[PDB]
């Protein structure tokens, strides 16, 4: 009936081993699972614990279960940016027929990577085609950072986004900006 | 075998109109459920069914209906259309026996209701060349991509290099921007970045174009305003390498 997680925001950085629990109050249990639903999409069967313990290994994944049943932990170990997600706790008054499965409001997950040689700036991009508009990139900054919104009607002004070169083995975070022309320069743009 | 299949994925409507979200299963499973969680929130079942001809509902205040006419399909639908409405719908199912399984997979519906629709817009796309600063400090070389002045917040990017759509060294913003906020029906704006190495992006033969496509109107709908008719389609910028 009552079905609670925590935390219920967190993040944290790769190779990180993080574990987060579950609560409830519900009569009768039978199955206990774990979902991974990502933004804009639909959750994902990780894991369905039974009468059976408080351990059930999925790769890098782990459950536990109550003893009594009262509340579980999902245990993930090295932890990897594809993993920072929202992830739900799901409980069911038994019945493979005549069950009903209570979800937690679930706590969104965030994974950063980790920051070594930093290097922050930003430049000034030109258009392709010939035209007199233009937009400001900051990039190579630690995770730490924090990207202030604009906040200045005219400008734009988008949180950091990170993109990894395999082939170099290499992340990098980055925001971008743009605005109408006028009294625009990348010095002033991306100002705290 | 198969998973679920929803249908639409995207799709713009005008209030007043009949909608008919529908979604199929070939695993058999007789537990059909159907959540919707409005943007910034968690799911909300509002219908469920044990098989055909039963239909259940989870929150009383619903306002659309569904039809399990065939253990295959569980099409839920929506009378009249209501801004109200505007969120996401995800179709579910679950296993038969034993340790219940379920798999939703349904990729989800993503619903827009527009009060009347000629606040419907495509996306203007533009690519800009990396700043030859960043490459000689840097030695690699960064493209972004502008999706502008397009609503419903409905599109796909993709860049595609030399012919091929390409993920690695590429982000883009997991939530669009609104240009004109003060509007809750304000157009939206995107971006996405790009990186390489320098002496690739210095090689005139490489091909850059970044892809984007838009889920607007179907040809069918009305459309009568002074401009060419907002249909799902798909817009396109592209870039080349160049030494300079």
């Known amino acids: 009936n009552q079905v609670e997680q925590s935390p219920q925001s967190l993040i944290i950085l790769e190779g990180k081993n993080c574990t987060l629990q579950?609560?409830?109050?519900?009569?009768?249990?039978?199955?206990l699972r774990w979902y991974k639903q990502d933004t804009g999409r639909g959750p994902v069967s990780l894991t369905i614990?039974?009468?059976?313990?408080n351990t059930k290994s999925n790769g890098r994944y782990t459950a536990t279960l109550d003893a009594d049943t009262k509340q579980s932990s999902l245990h993930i170990t090295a932890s990897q940016l594809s993993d920072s997600a929202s992830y739900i706790c799901?409980?069911?008054?038994?019945?493979?027929?005549?069950?009903?499965?209570?979800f937690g409001r679930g706590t969104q997950l965030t994974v950063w990577p980790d920051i070594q040689k930093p290097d922050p700036a930003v430049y000034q991009l030109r258009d392709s085609k010939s035209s007199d508009k233009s937009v400001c990139l900051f990039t190579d900054f630690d995770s730490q950072t924090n990207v202030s919104q604009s906040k200045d009607s005219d400008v734009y002004i988008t949180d950091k986004t990170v993109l990894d070169m395999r082939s170099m083995d290499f992340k990098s975070n980055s925001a971008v900006a743009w605005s109408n022309k006028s009294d625009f320069a990348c010095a002033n743009a991306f100002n705290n | 075998e198969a998973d679920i299949y929803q249908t639409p994925r995207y799709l713009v409507i005008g209030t007043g109109k009949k909608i008919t979200l529908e979604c199929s299963q070939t695993?058999?499973?007789?537990?059909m459920y159907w959540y919707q969680q409005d943007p910034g929130m968690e799911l909300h079942l509002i219908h469920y069914?044990?098989?055909?001809?039963?239909?259940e509902k989870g929150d009383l205040s619903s306002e659309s209906t569904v039809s399990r006419i065939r253990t295959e399909h569980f099409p839920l639908t929506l009378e009249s259309a209501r801004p109200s409405h505007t969120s996401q719908y995800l179709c579910?199912?679950?296993?038969?026996?034993?340790?219940?399984?379920?798999?939703?997979f349904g990729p989800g519906t993503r619903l827009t209701v527009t009060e009347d629709l000629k606040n419907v817009f495509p996306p203007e796309v533009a690519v800009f060349e990396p700043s030859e600063a960043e490459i000689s400090h840097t030695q690699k070389a960064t493209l972004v991509c502008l999706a502008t002045g397009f609503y419903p917040d409905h599109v796909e990017l993709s860049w595609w290099v030399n012919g091929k759509e390409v993920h690695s060294g590429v982000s883009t913003d997991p939530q669009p921007l609104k240009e004109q906020p003060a509007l809750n029906d304000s157009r939206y704006a995107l971006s996405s970045r790009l990186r390489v190495s320098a002496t690739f992006w210095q090689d005139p033969r490489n091909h850059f174009r970044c892809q984007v496509q838009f889920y607007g109107l179907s040809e069918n709908d009305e459309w009568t305003q002074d401009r060419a008719k907002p249909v799902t389609q798909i817009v396109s910028a592209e870039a080349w390498g160049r030494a300079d």
């Open positions: 579910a199912s679950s296993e038969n026996i034993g340790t219940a399984y379920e798999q939703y």
């Open positions: 579950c609560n409830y109050t519900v009569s009768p249990f039978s199955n």
């Open positions: 614990m039974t009468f059976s313990e």
């Open positions: 799901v409980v069911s008054d038994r019945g493979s027929t005549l069950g009903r499965l209570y």
């Open positions: 695993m058999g499973h007789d537990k």
């Open positions: 069914s044990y098989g055909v001809n039963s239909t």
